[PDB]
Amino acid sequence: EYTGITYISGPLLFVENAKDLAYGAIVDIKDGTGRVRGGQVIEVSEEYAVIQVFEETTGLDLATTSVSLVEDVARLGVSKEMLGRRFNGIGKPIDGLPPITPEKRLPITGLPLNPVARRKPEQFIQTGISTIDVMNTLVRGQKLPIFSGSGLPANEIAAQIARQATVRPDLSGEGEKEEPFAVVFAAMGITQRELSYFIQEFERTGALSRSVLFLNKADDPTIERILTPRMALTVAEYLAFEHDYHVLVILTDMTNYCEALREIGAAREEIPGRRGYPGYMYTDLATIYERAGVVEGKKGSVTQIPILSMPDDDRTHPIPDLTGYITEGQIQLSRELHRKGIYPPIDPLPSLSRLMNNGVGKGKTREDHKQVSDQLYSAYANGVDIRKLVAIIGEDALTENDRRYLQFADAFERFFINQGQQNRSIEESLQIAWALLSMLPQGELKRISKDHIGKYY
Template identity: 60%
Template structure:
């Protein structure tokens, strides 16, 4: 029988403190009944033999010391079924799309755990996002966690939506040949977004039909901060169920992790914890790792979980604790650049500081195309050289540069205009991306392509492109 207490001693921000006469389990779910009869759900955040701290999901407004507290003896569970695909849920996991109630096949605690390293399958196999700057230069690999670093006001949401509706695992490119019939699903967890952003997300999902293969969790900016702590865990529990029970390749997109970390800081302040860097909790690294490490593949399992966390860097500072700690845990980063955005480049991905640490293991023959690695390396080197020369032009002028230097400057301009620039509605196959890459590399003499195998130059180099460039010069 559930015991009911009327022993609330303090209410501080999103937290309620109450006295108890027996130990209560950590993470246990609590119901708080206010004097007007409304019920609020909460979770045990701190416990001792005589007192507990409860974080209240719906906020503490209306709760006073006359409210009663009931401990349910269980942790927060997620109702799971394959029929969740196509549904829109609140940040607390309740349906908000007007559809029927969820009839679960099973329930699971949302506090999952990282995949056992011994049971992990090494991430391999290319996920095609349809975005050349990602597919060609910073390839997303099945089972990888690859964050998107952006800043306030940049179009990271548009890029996230583009990836959500375009991403696929090309079955015919699988290196192992065991993915036939495996489906692709997207779990989209939005935390602390505005109502306007939520409307844009839903309009895009419904307009493009992407909602049919997606589960959307929406936590709005005016929802309680505590709910933001729960939202990604609900999303990842759903991802694990679809991936490892039903064999889906799941892409989990979480935006914005900065709002999640701000909620951590708010709760830490309410608990009067000693703050760490810039006021964030000292355990933020561990907390983020408990989310990011739920991505991956498991030996003997067909499905996989790939994560694309999105965070807005405060003041565009990549050394800020949130991107800094995220970079330690994850396998690279995609950088959304303000300068490219101001030039009208869509999507404004800066490939030079971007990195996918697992790219080499998921591209090449059997995955994408045999020349992919060499093309990416040569494009990177040529663009970096052209980009460096732009600084020199500002000092000495373009006329003072050699013909070779001018060619690299032209290469850098065309790389941004043709390779990176594609708009948010264009879906390019990896073949199209590599074809554009060879068009650009053919601007340079073959002897400049020192990172590409001669066999690939003979097969893919375009003499007509080089002749056209020389004629214009």
């Protein structure tokens, strides 16, 4: 609550006698007007300390600068009472409803659990789509990345399938007793426009009535921004991990994760190693895709989903490298795809959930899915060859057998991949594949077994 502030940079502020404080803390600071702002507790040395004002900066004076000690580490209140609440960045009551009932003020970062507990996520999951459930599904707790474009229909295709998602234990042989549906979404650096496109999907159909919001606009303060995700992130845990519910964490443009980052080191003196960024991102970032998985004994499992855009769609950047290193999959979007009108414009092989190849098929989703999942993959792409070779010979200039492998691709991207807002049940989604496969007389598919095709086909 002291005064005498020396050395002030932007939303930063130093204060002596910092032996009562400790890095990892925050308190509200008051200049002259007595305005209540804030500031994180950094460098608590003998001489002075380091604080980071919530707001941008304007409002710090030389005379007064006392501070009301909030709490070394602050954490929002957790509970099951948040089935439609709304919060931004830090995550404070903006939805109008009463301050969330605090159950336990857990650290926004409880770090990973016993690695011995962690199990392989293999509970099949639908998303109201075909292509994104057949060729590449998503297993419970599986941290699946989504390579998006920095200005692509991302923002949309994001929240689009968001609500579409629906967990189906039924097909496995269980009910929704221990398998509840919990939707958590948190963005950052959002345009005033977009900040409004979001709030829309929830209000659509029974979407917000079972979810909580979080998103620190880029114009907002850069402080809550970083942690912004960690909030509901650490909070989803109390859901599936503490009670055994089933949560879905979905990142959003880590552009923020790093832009915001730069400031921390840019001030903290944290020298940026490669690509002009902090020489300890891997680590700090790792702690991210760790909040997803499964433990021995608990069925409750939260599924994790990263989603970001590169600087110029360069995978050589951290934004991609990092992920493409810890994430168990890959799912990008191409200009091409969308240019023709494909929506969702999602490529084939370029996108795929690394660990959704085992949690499918027998018992899980559609027995024959086992081989069905690797059929349309090698079979489809096979046609993408006679797709750019028209100018070579022509339409009828090509054989029947291989030419046929063409009509497929077009009927495949236009109808199969571009599925817009539609919501295809995990089963309504598998059928389609079959249907398309009919192009080639029963006997041309070398991927699946004659057994399965000689039936579903």
